[PDB]
Amino acid sequence: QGIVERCCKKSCDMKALREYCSVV
Amino acid sequence: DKECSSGLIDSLERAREFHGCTIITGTEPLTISIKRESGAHVMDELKYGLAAVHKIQSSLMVHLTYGLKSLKFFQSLTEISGDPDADKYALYVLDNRDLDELWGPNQTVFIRKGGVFFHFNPKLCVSTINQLLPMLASKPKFFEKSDVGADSNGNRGSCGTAVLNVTLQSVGANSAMLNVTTKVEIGEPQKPSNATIVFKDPRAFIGFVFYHMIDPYGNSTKSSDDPCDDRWKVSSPEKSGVMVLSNLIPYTNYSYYVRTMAISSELTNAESDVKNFRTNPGRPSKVTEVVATAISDSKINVTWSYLDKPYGVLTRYFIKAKLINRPTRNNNRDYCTEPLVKAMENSSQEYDDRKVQAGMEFENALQNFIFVPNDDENTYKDEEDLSSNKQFYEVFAKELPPNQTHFVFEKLRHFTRYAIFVVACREEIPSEKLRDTSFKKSLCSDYDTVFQTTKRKKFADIVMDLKVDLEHAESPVRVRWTPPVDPNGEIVTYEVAYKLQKPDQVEEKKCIPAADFNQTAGYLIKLNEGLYSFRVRANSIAGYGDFTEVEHIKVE
Amino acid sequence: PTMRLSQNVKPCKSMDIRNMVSHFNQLENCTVIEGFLLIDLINDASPLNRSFPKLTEVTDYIIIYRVTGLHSLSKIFPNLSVIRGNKLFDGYALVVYSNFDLMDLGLHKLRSITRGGVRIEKNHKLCYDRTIDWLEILAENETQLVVLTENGKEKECRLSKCPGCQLHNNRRLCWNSKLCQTKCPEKCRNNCIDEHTCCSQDCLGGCVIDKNGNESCISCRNVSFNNICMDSCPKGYYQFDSRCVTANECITLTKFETNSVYSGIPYNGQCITHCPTGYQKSENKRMCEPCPGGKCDKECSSGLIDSLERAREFHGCTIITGTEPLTISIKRESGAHVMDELKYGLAAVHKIQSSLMVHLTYGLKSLKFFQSLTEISGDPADKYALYVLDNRDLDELWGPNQTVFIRKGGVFFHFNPKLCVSTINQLLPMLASKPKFFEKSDVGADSNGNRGSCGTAVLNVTLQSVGANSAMLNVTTKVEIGEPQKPSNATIVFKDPRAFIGFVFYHMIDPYGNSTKSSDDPCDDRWKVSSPEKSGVMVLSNLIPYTNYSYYVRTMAISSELTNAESDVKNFRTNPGRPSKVTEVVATAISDSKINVTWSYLDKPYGVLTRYFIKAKLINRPTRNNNRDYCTEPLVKAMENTYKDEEDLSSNKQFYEVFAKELPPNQTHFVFEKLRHFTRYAIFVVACREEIPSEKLRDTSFKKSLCSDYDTVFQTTKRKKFADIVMDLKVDLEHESPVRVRWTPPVDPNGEIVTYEVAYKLQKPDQVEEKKCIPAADFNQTAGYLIKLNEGLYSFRVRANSIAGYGDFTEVEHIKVE
Amino acid sequence: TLCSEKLNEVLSMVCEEYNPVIP
Ligand SMILES: *[C@@H]1O[C@H](CO)[C@@H](O)[C@H](O)[C@H]1NC(C)=O
Ligand SMILES: *[C@@H]1O[C@H](CO)[C@@H](O)[C@H](O)[C@H]1NC(C)=O
Ligand SMILES: *[C@@H]1O[C@H](CO)[C@@H](O)[C@H](O)[C@H]1NC(C)=O
Ligand SMILES: *[C@@H]1O[C@H](CO)[C@@H](O)[C@H](O)[C@H]1NC(C)=O
Ligand SMILES: *[C@@H]1O[C@H](CO)[C@@H](O)[C@H](O)[C@H]1NC(C)=O
Ligand SMILES: *[C@@H]1O[C@H](CO)[C@@H](O)[C@H](O)[C@H]1NC(C)=O
Ligand SMILES: *[C@@H]1O[C@H](CO)[C@@H](O)[C@H](O)[C@H]1NC(C)=O
Ligand SMILES: *[C@@H]1O[C@H](CO)[C@@H](O)[C@H](O)[C@H]1NC(C)=O
Ligand SMILES: *[C@@H]1O[C@H](CO)[C@@H](O)[C@H](O)[C@H]1NC(C)=O
Ligand SMILES: *[C@@H]1O[C@H](CO)[C@@H](O)[C@H](O)[C@H]1NC(C)=O
Ligand SMILES: *[C@@H]1O[C@H](CO)[C@@H](O)[C@H](O)[C@H]1NC(C)=O
Ligand SMILES: *[C@@H]1O[C@H](CO)[C@@H](O)[C@H](O)[C@H]1NC(C)=O
Ligand SMILES: *[C@@H]1O[C@H](CO)[C@@H](O)[C@H](O)[C@H]1NC(C)=O
Ligand SMILES: *[C@@H]1O[C@H](CO)[C@@H](O)[C@H](O)[C@H]1NC(C)=O
Ligand SMILES: *[C@@H]1O[C@H](CO)[C@@H](O)[C@H](O)[C@H]1NC(C)=O
Ligand SMILES: *[C@@H]1O[C@H](CO)[C@@H](O)[C@H](O)[C@H]1NC(C)=O
């Protein structure tokens, strides 16, 4: 899954992408 | 009509047999299975063969063929009675490499009976198949997957094409710059709308490819009947959308168009229409065939023609003639011993995709693991320069309308050499005449000087004011005269001839160099008593001259 | 002998230098990285000051991704000697990707990468990347895992001068401008200390030399124990990728999968991450057991296998299920390491509940890695169970002894350029319905295998006879038609007389004899393919003599019947023929008796030129244009094979009528001698070749034509010497009678004499002559030319005149008249 | 759809920092 299957083969949002971080 | 028998066309040669046939008959299906080995011109032969046909009694089949660019060569086909090949099909198209289009845009075929069949046509769009949908007698709503290979037709002949605007930004003597103004959206932009030419993944776009070739007629077409064509010059792909065509021939009608190049797996593509432009004027070619000839002492004739392309519109021919000093006698060379009479001079392209695909997939593989989910003039102009003495022109120049191929001079410096230009000039473009200062002009051709001489003189050299004296009535007889008023070149020797007025006597003549006259401009000759006659003449580097009138003396 | 390691090695588990520079602290004291080491996403690395000389080797791999503020990779890796690569990330051991500040690698001490390869990409400020011969660093087996692209090498990086350093392969070999790279001979296999100081085979990457002379390996080639190397671990200890540990110790060592934190299991002496096939771990996770029989099954979900690394997580799966078809789409620049990984990923599976799809693959050689697959179940991809589309590297399907039962649905095939249709047909008995042939709507005939040689059979073609313009070919291999006339012995049967169209022959000029083949696409089809012939006997005509042709024979049949044969290329040279005309002959007049001939041979000679040949013939000079009166207007100056050696000489032996000389093939210039003065000469310049032995041992004396055709060139000897004028002049009064002057004409005329000029002058000063013209002919009838002259003293001169032009006057003589 | 360089930039813009993979 990782990233590309989440945000490359289909769109992502500013939350669906916010989980890959240590801070905000 | 002929109602020719149907059959299998295994080659172009067999296709020739069908020439002039308006109707094809025979229960077995007409078959087109022409290969093409080491050659071209499939289209012309086939159309010459089948162009006459307008109706097929049985079904049509075409498969296992190469180079058959299209099925449009049936230049008159409108009916297919559709007697099958299998009981269900009346048009059978299978495994046709590089086949890319069915009937022409303004042509329709009535499939009287049965359905169509299409599979494994790598260069034929599925959408082009549906153009046949309204033509069938059965009028189906769509083609079933069993009849049309939705995922096996045109899989690498993509035809989701959209048009691209192109515009020229600047042109020059040998180069031009091209834009693409329909903004392709490399990578989905995620905020905005518009930009219909959008690539879902930025890596999938290789770059724009520019095509251009010389076309005086401005009617060259994109494709070609031959399966191989190399008239287009194909540029390398870049993603900037800006190209600078260079090494162009000035003032030649170029034609160009652009296409977007993408990975083999990307379906979207785009192309522009063929556009035309000219490469601005350059330096006109030097005048050809120029030749000069003498007419008389003071008149010369020049003729020329323009046998090579002018690189622009001729505005005016320009002629210049400079006097070049006539020769001077070489003092180290003797005369009266070597007299002068003066003879006078004068392929596979097949883009490969492995590298970019591998890189694209490695990118995805990596990110899934890293992230975690919490000597010549330039000022030609009209000019006449009459010599100080005002008899002849030392420099003469004029402009001429471009249609005047010949010109003559007058009042030249009689016997002498002349060097002359014959140069063309073209019109000035606004970007030069109202945007550039008077340097770097280069708007006139180079010249090849032609050296030519005039005729000697109508009356030639002469020595006037002759008179002969005898002083002290013991001194030898002597001759007096004046040098020529306007001698050709310069006089080298004076040749005083004389005769004795007595039968059985013949004229005999002295010979002296032009010098030896500084003391009184007089020459003395010993002679015995008698009655004689004298007659002087001059010799010049231009040749011999004419005698004067005789004189007489009675010596004693 | 027993061997030591340098330094007391300390291991540390796999590491990820992430976010901030201060996290480098955890890399302290790490002699060897137990797993992988990744350094990534450091926005600025400049502040770090400490190098890590202790770090010696890494087991799995190194990746550098999006690290900036770093200029020399040596800043972190002073002594990265060997990369063992027990586990590879997508088949790669060293990855340096998308880094803008990197310029120097500084891997001086690196010697060997044990598996996989290296990918260096997207480093615009990097240089020297292409200079190092990675082939010397990688393993002796397949090495193509080398991708060096997009590293600013356009123009700016061309300052990669290297020291001055050794130069090989038309390039310098250096890590950077001040670090020449190190090689060593084959006896060391790239673990030598320097070009010659090579250590024991027990070491990998090198060794330290003790002051006592003892060696100390930088790293063990085999496993290690108690800082000593040996072939294999001692009993009671289990190998853990670089050394031997106790079972209790191995139980604690972890390793990192895509997401799983696995722990080693000590079994059969190996600290394996998970139990092998046919085994299951005890619920206490202490050892591996055969589970409940050989069927230690495991089901897994289908998905998209976009890359090798994604395929790893399928390891140990015996059953694949899910409505989504399993699609293989791995695309690699080359299949150098794909099989080794895919086999580990999927070899365990034996049954698939869903369909199989393989499309858009690059670098797949075959589906062999489905080692235990036996059933597909064709659950769907509706109506299609197997799907193979657009694989420009796929070569063959399951191994010969494999058999997969497609329970439901058909199969699809398309755009598989190297997949041979013969291999496709092996699936016919494998379908549930067992049809005798595939539908024409499901497997193409030209879409598959149009570019791969694959099967067929070799055909023996032999050359029978040759000539200067033609050749003739056999095909020794037999061809059985319909029912085989006699089985065995290379029958190459066609099962139908209708099928066999015939043999097709190709030929084309190739001096080097290394052209490849006729391509499958228009253009570049330079072979002059002949028409098919049934007999197998073919003749080639209109050939250029003495040219190296290349030819091959290919069969063909109706409806592309798959039984066909083909032959490899061969070379032959036509016979010498006749050499071409000599090029650019020029003749110049050196003197009154010498002509200078210069020539060149800028043309194809054929054979080898063996003897140049020059021949010169005298051509009688023009004479007596009697139509013109020379006295009225005189001519002032003039204008313009089967043989054997040796020349001919004139009767008076003053000139050669005809001259012919053999020459060695060196010559480009020649000068004659004793040639007639002022006479046109016709000049040959002929070249000849060697004669083929047949032409004299089996041919009679006719035709031959071993010598080129001759083109004549003309020239004239220049004007003779100044002399050769009127001789023996004398003058006397005939008696009041007219004066007479008599002489004798020249014995050696410069061409026949046409006019005589009697130039006479008075002796008085400042005088000029009054020469008279005599039109020869009647000159000497009166034994002297009469002339009327009055009283006085005169000087007489005489000169001749010829077609060569004016002569020059004889010396003056005097006469007095009264 | 964010892929490759565009997604790398989006990540750089968002969260200003990332999390470990094997802390
Ligand atoms: C640009 O293309 C559009 C169609 O996409 C067309 O309507 C428009 O006229 C074009 N404009 C120019 C300047 O070419
Ligand atoms: C044409 O291309 C130039 C760059 O080469 C660009 O600055 C300009 O905007 C383009 N034209 C238009 C209409 O945008
Ligand atoms: C183009 O995009 C702008 C906003 O960037 C939008 O306002 C406009 O409507 C779009 N074009 C058309 C034809 O709608
Ligand atoms: C283009 O026009 C010229 C005449 O101007 C004609 O001779 C030529 O055949 C045309 N070419 C095409 C491709 O239409
Ligand atoms: C060449 O292009 C110009 C415009 O750039 C056009 O006026 C001219 O007609 C073209 N040439 C021909 C032969 O049509
Ligand atoms: C040349 O053209 C001019 C007009 O430009 C015209 O007056 C003249 O008669 C022409 N001469 C010839 C010889 O065609
Ligand atoms: C002189 O030139 C004119 C054209 O200017 C030409 O008609 C005439 O024939 C020429 N005469 C000679 C003798 O060359
Ligand atoms: C480990 O690192 C510390 C510093 O953090 C150092 O004091 C110590 O000597 C090191 N131990 C070894 C064995 O290198
Ligand atoms: C040197 O680097 C270490 C981290 O490796 C850091 O903690 C230390 O502050 C640095 N020294 C200086 C003087 O900045
Ligand atoms: C299967 O293997 C045996 C040897 O074990 C061999 O004889 C046989 O030919 C193989 N079958 C196929 C189809 O290759
Ligand atoms: C070669 O071909 C000839 C006929 O052209 C035949 O007589 C001869 O037996 C053939 N030889 C071989 C070895 O095939
Ligand atoms: C081809 O000739 C070789 C000998 O040169 C022989 O060993 C081989 O069996 C032959 N093959 C065929 C197919 O004739
Ligand atoms: C041509 O073929 C002959 C063999 O007959 C070979 O000796 C020669 O080297 C070939 N020529 C070249 C240029 O390779
Ligand atoms: C054949 O060899 C020559 C060198 O003699 C080389 O230039 C040429 O590229 C070679 N041909 C091929 C197809 O590699
Ligand atoms: C003249 O002959 C000499 C040999 O003595 C030779 O070197 C030279 O090339 C020849 N030149 C010409 C013009 O024949
Ligand atoms: C001429 O050719 C012969 C061989 O026939 C050779 O020995 C000699 O060196 C050559 N001389 C020159 C000057 O080429």
Residues B324 and B413: beta-carbon distance below 8 Å: no
Residues B498 and B529 in one domain: yes
Q: Which ligand gives the minimal distance to the CA of C399?
A: 10
Q: B365 touching D, CB under 8 A?
A: no
Tell me which chain B residues have a C-beta less than 8 angstroms from the C-beta of C41: 370
Residues C471 and C398 in one domain: no
Shortest CA gap B347–chain C (Å): 6
Domain boundary among C681, C716, C751: C716
Q: How far is CA C169 from CA C74, C149, C182, C269, C527, in A?
A: 26, 19, 14, 45, 35
Token pair, residue C751, equals 């061409």
Q: How far is CA C250 from CA B161, C227, C244, C261, in A?
A: 61, 18, 9, 14
Residues B59 and B25: beta-carbon distance below 8 Å: no
How many beta-carbon pairs below 8 A join chains B and D? 32
- In this structure, the residue with its CA closest to atom 6 of ligand 15 is C669
Length of chain C: 818
Tell me which chain B residues have a C-beta less than 8 angstroms from the C-beta of D18: 371-372
Residues C419 and C479 in one domain: no
Phi, psi at B537, each rounded to 5°: -155, 165
Please state the separation of Cα C145 from the chain's center in Å. 23
Best of B371, B372, B374 to disrupt the A interface by mutation (most A CBs within 10 Å)?
B371
The H helix count followed by the E strand count for chain B is 5, 40
d(CA B96, CA B100) in angstroms, rounded, equals 9
Decide if A20 and B372 are in contact by the 8 Å CB cutoff.
yes
Amino acid letter for position C736: E
Atom of ligand 7 nearest to the CA of B295: 13
d(CA C305, CA C286) in angstroms, rounded, equals 33
Residues B432 and B417: beta-carbon distance below 8 Å: no
Residue C629, domain member (yes or no): yes
Strand partners, C167: C172
- In this structure, the residue with its CA closest to atom 12 of ligand 9 is C49
Torsion angle, alpha carbons of C1, C7, C12, C16, to 10 = -110
Phi, psi at D7, each rounded to 5°: -65, -35
Neighbours of B, requiring at least 3 CB pairs below 8 Å, are A, C, D
Residues C466 and C401 in one domain: no
Residues B315 and B429 in one domain: yes
Token pair, residue C666, equals 């060196």
Enumerate long-range contacts of C705-710, CB under 8 Å, 24 or more apart.
Answer: C705/C578, C706/C578, C707/C578, C707/C579, C707/C613, C707/C641, C708/C578, C708/C579, C708/C580, C708/C581, C708/C582, C709/C578, C709/C581, C710/C581, C710/C641, C710/C684, C710/C685, C710/C686
| B11-32 b/e (C-beta count within 10 Å ≥ 16 → b) | ebeebeebeebebbbeeebbbb
Shortest CA gap A23–chain B (Å): 10
d(CA B536, CA B552) in angstroms, rounded, equals 12
Token pair, residue B371, equals 């992230």
The H-or-E segment that residue B356 falls in is: helix B354-370
Decide if D17 and A21 are in contact by the 8 Å CB cutoff.
yes
Residues C172 and C241 in one domain: no
Decide if B374 and D3 are in contact by the 8 Å CB cutoff.
no
Residues B541 and B413 in one domain: no
Q: Residue B501 is part of which domain span? A: 467-555
Tell me which chain D residues have a C-beta less than 8 angstroms from the C-beta of B360: 4
Residues B266 and B299 in one domain: no
d(CA C778, CA C705) in angstroms, rounded, equals 54
Whole-angstrom distance between the N-terminal and C-terminal Cα of chain D?
30
Residue B270, domain member (yes or no): yes
For residue C635, count other CB atoms closer than 10 A to its CB: 18
The H-or-E segment that residue B367 falls in is: helix B354-370
CA angle at C655 for the pair C651 and C657, rounded to the nearest 5°? 75
Q: Which residues contact B215 (CB under 8 A, 6 or more apart)?
A: B253, B254, B255, B276
* Closest C-alpha to C574, from C649, C469, C662: C469
Residue C253, domain member (yes or no): yes
- Reduced to 3 states (helix: H, G, I; strand: E, B; else coil), residue C704 is coil
Domain boundary among B224, B253, B277: B277
Decide if A20 and D19 are in contact by the 8 Å CB cutoff.
yes
Q: Which residues contact C132 (CB under 8 A, 6 or more apart)?
A: C105, C173, C174, C175, C181
Token pair, residue C495, equals 């099962």
Domain boundary among C690, C716, C742: C716
DSSP C330-361: -B-S-TTSHHHHHHHHHTT--EESS-EEEES-
d(CA B429, CA B440) in angstroms, rounded, equals 14
- β-strands C224-225, C228-229 pairing: antiparallel
- β-strands B205-214, B233-234 pairing: antiparallel
Token pair, residue B21, equals 């046939």
Q: B356 touching D, CB under 8 A?
A: no
d(CA C312, CA B143) in angstroms, rounded, equals 42
- Residue of chain B whose alpha carbon sits nearest to that of D19: B372
Residues C501 and C530: beta-carbon distance below 8 Å: no
Tell me which chain D residues have a C-beta less than 8 angstroms from the C-beta of C18: 18-21
Q: Which residues contact C110 (CB under 8 A, 6 or more apart)?
A: C80, C81, C82, C83, C137, C205
Decide if B202 and D21 are in contact by the 8 Å CB cutoff.
no
Residues B224 and B311 in one domain: no
d(CA C395, CA C406) in angstroms, rounded, equals 21
Residue C221, domain member (yes or no): no
* Closest C-alpha to C331, from C350, C352, C306, C355: C306
Decide if A20 and B364 are in contact by the 8 Å CB cutoff.
no
| Helix, strand, coil tally for chain B in percent (to 5) | 10, 35, 60
Q: How far is the CA of C10 from the centre of ligand 8 (A)?
A: 11
Residues B238 and B324 in one domain: no
- In this structure, the residue with its CA closest to atom 1 of ligand 3 is B194
Residue B501, domain member (yes or no): yes
d(CA C377, CA B252) in angstroms, rounded, equals 67
Residue with tokens 């200062």: B437
Please state the separation of Cα B229 from the chain's center in Å. 22
Name the region of C483 (left: φ>0; alpha: ψ -120 to 50; beta: rest). Answer: beta
Residues B296 and B430 in one domain: yes
Residue C204, domain member (yes or no): no
* Closest C-alpha to C85, from C145, C2, C7: C145
- Reduced to 3 states (helix: H, G, I; strand: E, B; else coil), residue B167 is strand
- Residue of chain A whose alpha carbon sits nearest to that of B367: A3
Decide if D8 and C66 are in contact by the 8 Å CB cutoff.
yes
Ligand 12 pocket, C474 CB below 6 A? no
Ligand 16 pocket, C666 CB below 6 A? yes
- In this structure, the residue with its CA closest to atom 3 of ligand 7 is B406
Domain count, chain C: 6
Residue C540, domain member (yes or no): yes
d(CA C214, CA C322) in angstroms, rounded, equals 62
Ligand 12 pocket, C462 CB below 6 A? no
Q: Which ligand gives the minimal distance to the CA of C715?
A: 15
For residue B322, count other CB atoms closer than 10 A to its CB: 16
How many beta-carbon pairs below 8 A join chains C and D? 19
The H-or-E segment that residue B52 falls in is: none
Decide if C445 and B95 are in contact by the 8 Å CB cutoff.
yes
Decide if C66 and D18 are in contact by the 8 Å CB cutoff.
no
d(CA B38, CA B24) in angstroms, rounded, equals 30
Residue with tokens 């990307």: B266
- Reduced to 3 states (helix: H, G, I; strand: E, B; else coil), residue C49 is coil
**Which of the listed residues C601, C662, C666 should we mutate to test ligand 16's pocket, taking the one with most ligand atoms within 8 A of CB?**
C666
d(CA C654, CA C651) in angstroms, rounded, equals 8
CATH number at residue B71: 3.80.20.20
Neighbours of A, requiring at least 3 CB pairs below 8 Å, are B, D
Residue C203, domain member (yes or no): no
Way the structure was solved: cryo-EM
Return residues 1-24 of A near B (CB < 8 Å): 1-5, 8, 19-20
DSSP A4-20: IIIIISS---TTTTGGG
Q: B134 touching A, CB under 8 A?
A: no
- β-strands B166-171, B176-180 pairing: antiparallel
Tell me which chain B residues have a C-beta less than 8 angstroms from the C-beta of A19: 373-374
Q: B367 touching A, CB under 8 A?
A: yes
Residues B421 and B319 in one domain: yes
DSSP C477-523: S---BSS-SS-SSS---BS-TTTEEEEEEEEEE-TTS------SSSS
CATH number at residue B488: 2.60.40.10
Shortest CA gap D7–chain C (Å): 13
